[PDB]
Coordinates of N, CA and C and ligand atoms in Angstrom, one line a residue:
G1 N 71.7 -49.7 42.5 CA 71.3 -50.0 41.1 C 71.8 -48.9 40.2
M2 N 71.3 -48.8 38.9 CA 71.7 -47.8 38.0 C 70.5 -47.4 37.2
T3 N 70.6 -46.2 36.5 CA 69.6 -45.8 35.6 C 70.3 -45.2 34.4
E4 N 69.8 -45.5 33.2 CA 70.3 -45.0 32.0 C 69.4 -43.9 31.5
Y5 N 70.1 -42.8 30.9 CA 69.4 -41.7 30.4 C 69.9 -41.4 29.0
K6 N 69.0 -41.1 28.1 CA 69.3 -40.8 26.7 C 69.2 -39.2 26.5
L7 N 70.4 -38.6 26.2 CA 70.5 -37.2 26.2 C 70.9 -36.8 24.7
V8 N 70.4 -35.6 24.3 CA 70.7 -35.1 23.0 C 71.2 -33.7 23.1
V9 N 72.4 -33.4 22.5 CA 73.0 -32.1 22.5 C 72.8 -31.5 21.2
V10 N 72.1 -30.3 21.1 CA 71.7 -29.7 19.9 C 72.0 -28.2 19.9
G11 N 72.0 -27.6 18.7 CA 72.4 -26.2 18.6 C 73.2 -26.0 17.3
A12 N 73.4 -24.7 17.0 CA 74.2 -24.4 15.8 C 75.6 -25.1 15.9
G13 N 76.1 -25.3 14.7 CA 77.5 -25.7 14.6 C 78.4 -24.7 15.2
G14 N 79.5 -25.1 15.9 CA 80.5 -24.2 16.3 C 80.3 -23.7 17.7
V15 N 79.3 -24.1 18.4 CA 79.0 -23.6 19.7 C 79.8 -24.3 20.9
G16 N 80.3 -25.5 20.6 CA 81.0 -26.3 21.6 C 80.2 -27.6 22.0
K17 N 79.3 -28.1 21.2 CA 78.6 -29.3 21.6 C 79.6 -30.5 21.8
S18 N 80.5 -30.7 20.8 CA 81.5 -31.7 21.0 C 82.4 -31.4 22.1
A19 N 82.9 -30.2 22.3 CA 83.8 -29.9 23.4 C 83.1 -30.2 24.8
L20 N 81.9 -29.9 24.9 CA 81.1 -30.1 26.1 C 81.0 -31.6 26.4
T21 N 80.6 -32.4 25.3 CA 80.5 -33.8 25.4 C 81.8 -34.5 25.8
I22 N 82.9 -34.1 25.1 CA 84.2 -34.7 25.3 C 84.7 -34.3 26.7
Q23 N 84.4 -33.1 27.2 CA 84.7 -32.9 28.6 C 84.1 -33.9 29.5
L24 N 82.8 -34.1 29.3 CA 82.1 -35.0 30.2 C 82.6 -36.5 30.1
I25 N 82.9 -36.9 28.8 CA 83.2 -38.3 28.7 C 84.7 -38.6 28.9
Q26 N 85.6 -37.7 28.5 CA 87.1 -37.9 28.6 C 87.8 -37.0 29.6
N27 N 87.1 -36.0 30.2 CA 87.6 -35.2 31.3 C 88.7 -34.3 30.9
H28 N 88.7 -33.8 29.6 CA 89.5 -32.7 29.2 C 88.9 -32.0 28.0
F29 N 89.5 -30.8 27.8 CA 89.1 -30.0 26.7 C 89.8 -30.4 25.4
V30 N 89.1 -30.8 24.4 CA 89.6 -31.1 23.1 C 89.1 -30.0 22.2
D31 N 90.1 -29.2 21.8 CA 89.7 -28.0 21.0 C 89.6 -28.2 19.5
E32 N 90.0 -29.3 19.0 CA 89.8 -29.6 17.6 C 89.1 -30.9 17.5
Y33 N 87.9 -30.9 17.1 CA 87.1 -32.1 16.9 C 86.2 -31.9 15.7
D34 N 86.4 -32.8 14.7 CA 85.8 -32.6 13.4 C 84.4 -32.1 13.5
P35 N 84.1 -30.9 13.0 CA 82.7 -30.4 13.1 C 81.6 -31.2 12.5
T36 N 82.0 -32.2 11.6 CA 81.0 -32.9 10.9 C 80.7 -34.3 11.6
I37 N 81.4 -34.6 12.6 CA 81.1 -35.9 13.3 C 79.9 -35.8 14.2
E38 N 78.9 -36.6 13.8 CA 77.7 -36.7 14.7 C 77.7 -38.2 15.1
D39 N 77.6 -38.4 16.4 CA 77.7 -39.7 17.0 C 77.2 -39.7 18.4
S40 N 76.9 -40.9 18.9 CA 76.6 -41.1 20.3 C 77.7 -41.7 21.1
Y41 N 77.8 -41.3 22.4 CA 78.9 -41.6 23.3 C 78.3 -42.0 24.6
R42 N 78.7 -43.1 25.2 CA 78.2 -43.5 26.5 C 79.2 -43.2 27.6
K43 N 78.7 -42.7 28.7 CA 79.6 -42.4 29.9 C 78.8 -42.7 31.1
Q44 N 79.5 -43.4 32.0 CA 78.9 -43.7 33.4 C 79.4 -42.6 34.3
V45 N 78.5 -42.0 35.1 CA 78.8 -41.0 36.1 C 78.0 -41.4 37.4
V46 N 78.1 -40.6 38.4 CA 77.4 -40.8 39.6 C 76.7 -39.5 39.9
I47 N 75.3 -39.5 40.0 CA 74.5 -38.3 40.2 C 73.7 -38.5 41.4
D48 N 73.9 -37.6 42.4 CA 73.1 -37.8 43.7 C 73.2 -39.2 44.2
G49 N 74.4 -39.8 44.1 CA 74.6 -41.1 44.7 C 74.2 -42.3 43.8
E50 N 73.5 -42.0 42.7 CA 73.1 -43.1 41.8 C 74.0 -43.2 40.5
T51 N 74.4 -44.4 40.3 CA 75.2 -44.7 39.0 C 74.2 -44.4 37.9
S52 N 74.7 -43.5 37.0 CA 73.9 -43.0 35.9 C 74.7 -43.3 34.6
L53 N 74.1 -44.1 33.7 CA 74.7 -44.3 32.4 C 74.1 -43.3 31.4
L54 N 74.9 -42.4 30.9 CA 74.4 -41.4 29.9 C 74.8 -41.9 28.5
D55 N 73.7 -41.9 27.7 CA 73.8 -42.2 26.2 C 73.6 -40.9 25.5
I56 N 74.7 -40.2 25.0 CA 74.6 -38.8 24.6 C 74.8 -38.8 23.1
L57 N 73.9 -38.2 22.4 CA 74.1 -37.9 21.0 C 74.6 -36.5 20.8
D58 N 75.8 -36.4 20.2 CA 76.5 -35.1 19.9 C 76.2 -34.9 18.5
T59 N 75.3 -33.9 18.2 CA 74.9 -33.6 16.9 C 75.8 -32.6 16.2
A60 N 75.9 -32.8 14.9 CA 76.8 -31.9 14.0 C 76.0 -30.8 13.5
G61 N 76.4 -30.1 12.4 CA 75.7 -29.1 11.8 C 74.4 -29.7 11.2
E64 N 74.9 -33.6 6.8 CA 75.0 -33.1 8.2 C 74.2 -33.9 9.2
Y65 N 73.0 -34.1 8.9 CA 72.0 -34.8 9.8 C 72.1 -36.3 9.5
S66 N 72.6 -37.0 10.5 CA 72.8 -38.5 10.4 C 71.5 -39.2 10.7
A67 N 71.5 -40.5 10.5 CA 70.3 -41.4 10.8 C 70.1 -41.4 12.3
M68 N 71.1 -41.5 13.1 CA 70.9 -41.5 14.6 C 70.1 -40.4 15.0
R69 N 70.2 -39.2 14.3 CA 69.5 -38.0 14.8 C 68.0 -38.2 15.0
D70 N 67.4 -38.8 14.0 CA 66.0 -39.1 14.1 C 65.7 -40.1 15.3
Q71 N 66.5 -41.1 15.4 CA 66.3 -42.0 16.6 C 66.3 -41.3 17.9
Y72 N 67.3 -40.4 18.1 CA 67.5 -39.8 19.4 C 66.5 -38.6 19.6
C73 N 66.1 -38.0 18.5 CA 65.0 -37.0 18.6 C 63.7 -37.7 19.1
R74 N 63.4 -38.9 18.5 CA 62.2 -39.6 18.8 C 62.3 -40.1 20.3
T75 N 63.4 -40.7 20.7 CA 63.5 -41.4 21.9 C 64.3 -40.7 23.0
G76 N 64.8 -39.5 22.7 CA 65.7 -38.8 23.6 C 64.9 -38.4 24.8
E77 N 65.5 -38.5 26.0 CA 64.8 -38.1 27.2 C 65.0 -36.7 27.7
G78 N 66.2 -36.1 27.3 CA 66.5 -34.7 27.6 C 67.3 -34.1 26.6
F79 N 67.2 -32.8 26.5 CA 68.0 -32.1 25.4 C 68.7 -30.9 26.0
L80 N 70.0 -30.8 25.7 CA 70.8 -29.6 25.9 C 70.7 -28.7 24.7
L81 N 70.1 -27.5 24.9 CA 70.1 -26.5 23.8 C 71.2 -25.6 24.0
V82 N 72.2 -25.7 23.1 CA 73.5 -25.1 23.3 C 73.7 -23.9 22.4
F83 N 74.1 -22.7 22.9 CA 74.6 -21.6 22.1 C 75.9 -21.2 22.7
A84 N 76.6 -20.3 22.0 CA 77.8 -19.7 22.5 C 77.6 -18.2 22.8
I85 N 78.1 -17.8 24.0 CA 77.8 -16.5 24.5 C 78.4 -15.3 23.7
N86 N 79.3 -15.7 22.7 CA 79.9 -14.7 21.8 C 79.4 -14.8 20.4
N87 N 78.3 -15.5 20.2 CA 77.7 -15.7 18.9 C 76.2 -15.5 19.0
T88 N 75.7 -14.3 18.6 CA 74.3 -14.0 18.7 C 73.5 -14.9 17.8
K89 N 74.0 -15.2 16.6 CA 73.3 -16.1 15.7 C 73.0 -17.4 16.3
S90 N 73.9 -18.0 17.1 CA 73.7 -19.3 17.7 C 72.6 -19.2 18.8
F91 N 72.5 -18.1 19.5 CA 71.5 -17.8 20.4 C 70.1 -17.7 19.7
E92 N 70.1 -17.0 18.6 CA 68.8 -16.8 17.9 C 68.4 -18.2 17.3
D93 N 69.3 -19.1 17.0 CA 68.9 -20.4 16.5 C 68.2 -21.3 17.5
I94 N 68.4 -21.1 18.8 CA 67.9 -21.9 19.8 C 66.4 -22.3 19.6
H95 N 65.6 -21.2 19.3 CA 64.2 -21.5 19.2 C 63.8 -22.5 18.1
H96 N 64.6 -22.5 17.0 CA 64.3 -23.4 15.9 C 64.4 -24.9 16.4
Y97 N 65.4 -25.1 17.2 CA 65.7 -26.5 17.8 C 64.6 -26.8 18.8
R98 N 64.3 -25.9 19.7 CA 63.2 -26.2 20.7 C 61.9 -26.5 20.0
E99 N 61.6 -25.7 19.0 CA 60.3 -25.9 18.3 C 60.2 -27.2 17.6
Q100 N 61.4 -27.6 17.0 CA 61.4 -28.9 16.3 C 61.2 -30.1 17.3
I101 N 62.0 -30.0 18.4 CA 61.8 -31.1 19.5 C 60.4 -31.2 19.9
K102 N 59.7 -30.0 20.1 CA 58.3 -30.0 20.5 C 57.4 -30.6 19.5
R103 N 57.7 -30.4 18.2 CA 56.8 -30.9 17.1 C 57.0 -32.4 17.0
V104 N 58.1 -32.9 17.4 CA 58.4 -34.4 17.2 C 57.7 -35.1 18.4
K105 N 57.9 -34.6 19.6 CA 57.4 -35.3 20.8 C 55.8 -35.1 20.9
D106 N 55.2 -36.0 21.7 CA 53.8 -36.0 22.0 C 53.5 -35.1 23.2
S107 N 54.2 -35.3 24.3 CA 54.0 -34.4 25.5 C 54.6 -33.1 25.3
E108 N 54.1 -32.1 25.9 CA 54.6 -30.7 26.0 C 55.7 -30.6 27.0
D109 N 55.8 -31.5 28.0 CA 56.8 -31.5 29.1 C 58.0 -32.3 28.6
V110 N 58.9 -31.6 28.0 CA 60.1 -32.3 27.5 C 61.3 -31.7 28.3
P111 N 62.0 -32.5 29.0 CA 63.2 -32.0 29.8 C 64.3 -31.4 28.8
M112 N 64.6 -30.2 29.2 CA 65.6 -29.4 28.4 C 66.4 -28.5 29.4
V113 N 67.6 -28.2 29.0 CA 68.4 -27.2 29.7 C 69.0 -26.3 28.6
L114 N 68.9 -24.9 28.8 CA 69.6 -24.0 28.0 C 71.0 -23.8 28.4
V115 N 72.0 -23.9 27.5 CA 73.4 -23.9 27.9 C 74.1 -22.8 27.1
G116 N 74.6 -21.8 27.8 CA 75.4 -20.8 27.2 C 76.9 -21.0 27.4
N117 N 77.5 -21.5 26.3 CA 78.9 -22.0 26.4 C 79.9 -20.9 26.0
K118 N 81.2 -21.2 26.2 CA 82.3 -20.3 26.0 C 82.4 -19.1 26.9
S119 N 82.0 -19.3 28.2 CA 82.0 -18.2 29.2 C 83.3 -17.7 29.5
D120 N 84.4 -18.4 29.0 CA 85.7 -17.9 29.3 C 86.2 -16.8 28.3
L121 N 85.4 -16.6 27.2 CA 85.9 -15.7 26.2 C 85.5 -14.3 26.6
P122 N 86.3 -13.3 26.4 CA 85.9 -11.9 26.8 C 84.9 -11.2 25.9
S123 N 84.8 -11.7 24.7 CA 84.0 -11.0 23.7 C 82.6 -11.4 23.6
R124 N 81.9 -11.2 24.8 CA 80.5 -11.6 24.9 C 79.6 -10.7 24.1
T125 N 78.6 -11.4 23.5 CA 77.5 -10.7 22.8 C 76.1 -11.1 23.2
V126 N 75.9 -12.1 23.9 CA 74.6 -12.5 24.5 C 74.8 -12.5 26.0
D127 N 74.0 -11.7 26.7 CA 74.2 -11.6 28.2 C 73.3 -12.5 28.9
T128 N 73.7 -12.8 30.1 CA 73.0 -13.8 31.0 C 71.5 -13.4 31.2
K129 N 71.2 -12.1 31.2 CA 69.8 -11.7 31.4 C 69.0 -12.1 30.2
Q130 N 69.5 -11.9 28.9 CA 68.9 -12.4 27.7 C 68.6 -13.9 27.8
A131 N 69.6 -14.6 28.2 CA 69.5 -16.1 28.2 C 68.5 -16.6 29.3
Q132 N 68.6 -16.0 30.5 CA 67.7 -16.3 31.5 C 66.2 -16.0 31.1
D133 N 66.0 -14.9 30.4 CA 64.7 -14.5 29.9 C 64.2 -15.6 28.9
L134 N 65.1 -16.0 28.0 CA 64.6 -17.1 27.1 C 64.3 -18.4 27.9
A135 N 65.2 -18.8 28.7 CA 64.9 -20.0 29.5 C 63.6 -19.9 30.3
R136 N 63.4 -18.7 30.9 CA 62.1 -18.6 31.7 C 60.9 -18.7 30.7
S137 N 61.0 -18.1 29.5 CA 59.9 -18.2 28.6 C 59.7 -19.7 28.2
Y138 N 60.7 -20.5 28.3 CA 60.5 -22.0 28.0 C 60.3 -22.8 29.3
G139 N 60.4 -22.2 30.5 CA 60.3 -23.0 31.7 C 61.4 -24.0 32.0
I140 N 62.6 -23.6 31.6 CA 63.7 -24.6 31.7 C 64.9 -23.8 32.4
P141 N 65.8 -24.6 33.0 CA 67.0 -24.0 33.5 C 68.0 -23.4 32.5
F142 N 68.7 -22.4 32.9 CA 69.8 -21.8 32.1 C 71.1 -22.1 32.9
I143 N 72.1 -22.7 32.2 CA 73.4 -22.9 32.8 C 74.5 -22.4 31.9
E144 N 75.4 -21.5 32.4 CA 76.6 -21.0 31.7 C 77.7 -21.9 31.8
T145 N 78.4 -22.3 30.7 CA 79.5 -23.2 30.7 C 80.7 -22.7 30.0
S146 N 81.9 -23.2 30.3 CA 83.1 -23.2 29.5 C 83.6 -24.6 29.3
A147 N 83.4 -25.2 28.1 CA 84.0 -26.5 27.9 C 85.6 -26.4 28.0
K148 N 86.1 -25.2 27.9 CA 87.6 -25.0 28.0 C 88.1 -25.2 29.4
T149 N 87.4 -24.5 30.4 CA 87.8 -24.6 31.8 C 87.1 -25.6 32.6
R150 N 86.0 -26.2 32.0 CA 85.1 -27.1 32.7 C 84.0 -26.4 33.5
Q151 N 84.1 -25.1 33.7 CA 83.1 -24.4 34.6 C 81.7 -24.8 34.0
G152 N 80.8 -25.2 34.9 CA 79.4 -25.4 34.6 C 79.1 -26.7 33.8
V153 N 80.1 -27.4 33.3 CA 79.8 -28.5 32.4 C 79.1 -29.6 33.2
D154 N 79.6 -30.1 34.3 CA 78.9 -31.1 35.1 C 77.5 -30.6 35.5
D155 N 77.4 -29.3 35.9 CA 76.1 -28.8 36.3 C 75.1 -28.9 35.2
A156 N 75.6 -28.6 33.9 CA 74.7 -28.7 32.8 C 74.1 -30.1 32.6
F157 N 75.0 -31.1 32.6 CA 74.5 -32.5 32.3 C 73.8 -33.0 33.5
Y158 N 74.2 -32.8 34.8 CA 73.6 -33.3 35.9 C 72.2 -32.6 36.1
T159 N 72.1 -31.3 35.9 CA 70.8 -30.7 35.9 C 69.9 -31.3 34.9
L160 N 70.3 -31.5 33.7 CA 69.4 -32.2 32.7 C 68.9 -33.5 33.2
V161 N 69.8 -34.3 33.8 CA 69.4 -35.6 34.4 C 68.3 -35.4 35.5
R162 N 68.5 -34.4 36.3 CA 67.6 -34.1 37.4 C 66.2 -33.7 36.8
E163 N 66.2 -32.9 35.7 CA 65.0 -32.6 35.0 C 64.3 -33.8 34.5
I164 N 65.0 -34.8 33.9 CA 64.5 -36.0 33.4 C 63.8 -36.8 34.6
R165 N 64.6 -36.9 35.7 CA 64.0 -37.6 36.9 C 62.7 -37.0 37.3
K166 N 62.6 -35.6 37.3 CA 61.4 -35.0 37.7 C 60.2 -35.3 36.7
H167 N 60.5 -35.4 35.4 CA 59.5 -35.7 34.4 C 59.1 -37.2 34.6
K168 N 60.0 -38.1 34.9 CA 59.7 -39.5 35.0 C 58.8 -39.8 36.2
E169 N 58.9 -38.9 37.2 CA 58.1 -39.1 38.4 C 56.6 -38.8 38.2
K170 N 56.3 -38.2 37.1 CA 54.9 -37.8 36.9 C 54.0 -39.0 36.5
Ligands
LIG1 N1 87.3 -20.6 24.2 C1 86.4 -21.6 24.1 N2 86.4 -22.3 23.0 C2 85.5 -23.3 22.8 C3 84.7 -23.7 23.9 N3 83.9 -24.8 23.5 C4 84.3 -25.0 22.2 N4 85.3 -24.1 21.8 C5 85.9 -24.0 20.5 O1 84.8 -23.7 19.7 C6 85.0 -24.3 18.4 C7 83.8 -25.3 18.1 O2 83.8 -26.3 19.1 P1 83.1 -27.7 18.8 O3 83.2 -28.5 20.0 O4 83.7 -28.3 17.5 O5 81.6 -27.2 18.5 P2 80.4 -28.0 17.8 O6 80.4 -27.7 16.4 O7 79.2 -27.4 18.5 O8 80.5 -29.5 18.1 C8 86.3 -25.1 18.5 O9 87.3 -24.3 17.9 C9 86.5 -25.2 20.0 O10 87.9 -25.3 20.4 C10 84.7 -23.0 25.2 O11 84.0 -23.2 26.1 N5 85.6 -22.0 25.2
LIG2 S1 66.2 -33.7 18.1 C1 65.6 -32.4 17.0 C2 66.7 -31.6 16.4 C3 67.6 -32.1 15.3 N1 68.1 -31.1 14.5 C4 67.1 -30.5 13.6 O1 66.0 -30.9 13.5 C5 67.5 -29.3 12.8 C6 68.5 -29.1 11.8 N2 68.4 -27.9 11.3 N3 67.5 -27.2 12.0 C7 67.2 -25.8 11.8 C8 68.2 -24.9 11.9 C9 67.9 -23.5 11.5 C10 66.6 -23.2 11.1 O2 66.3 -21.9 10.8 C11 67.3 -20.9 10.7 C12 65.6 -24.2 11.0 C13 65.9 -25.5 11.3 C14 66.9 -28.0 12.9 C15 65.8 -27.6 13.9 F1 66.1 -26.4 14.4 F2 64.6 -27.6 13.2 F3 65.7 -28.4 14.9
LIG3 MG1 80.8 -31.1 17.0

């Protein structure tokens, strides 16, 4: 059989939300994608042997109508920052707090994603990010949309978090 999952990719503009999404759906790094495009994209993958239809909202900086739909009904959220942009890391909590204010339950599947791991000019270190993730009770995954490192882990881990929540 199959299962469908509604995922929402959030975070500051310029962190690589579109690049991560396009790696997952098209299997390559697209380095120029209009920063203002906010849209949903469907992709079928196989996760732990199960056909999984992912319905992914890639959010822009600006806020489209779909955004409220997917905030309301979204089953899991990728909180994305870039490891070379401290401001994007500091923005994470605003997004997490808003998701929590919208939802009824406090147990909302989320993964913290630190993107652009290929760049040498790091300003947020993995210890800082793991400490934030631990304070939220969620996984931290380091990614490079450019090389694909960690990208599949980030999305598949989020699906696994959703599955755990659905079992309750
Ligand atoms: N080096 C590197 N550049 C990236 C990575 N992900 C995104 N970019 C670049 O970062 C900028 C913003 O990416 P984009 O996908 O448009 O971010 P969004 O605004 O979060 O959707 C673009 O210039 C991308 O080429 C990455 O993992 N590594
Ligand atoms: S699914 C819920 C998320 C959708 N996006 C927002 O709600 C949003 C848009 N802008 N912000 C935001 C950014 C920075 C800030 O302080 C510097 C406050 C708000 C958000 C929010 F973070 F609230 F989610
Ligand atoms: Mg984008």
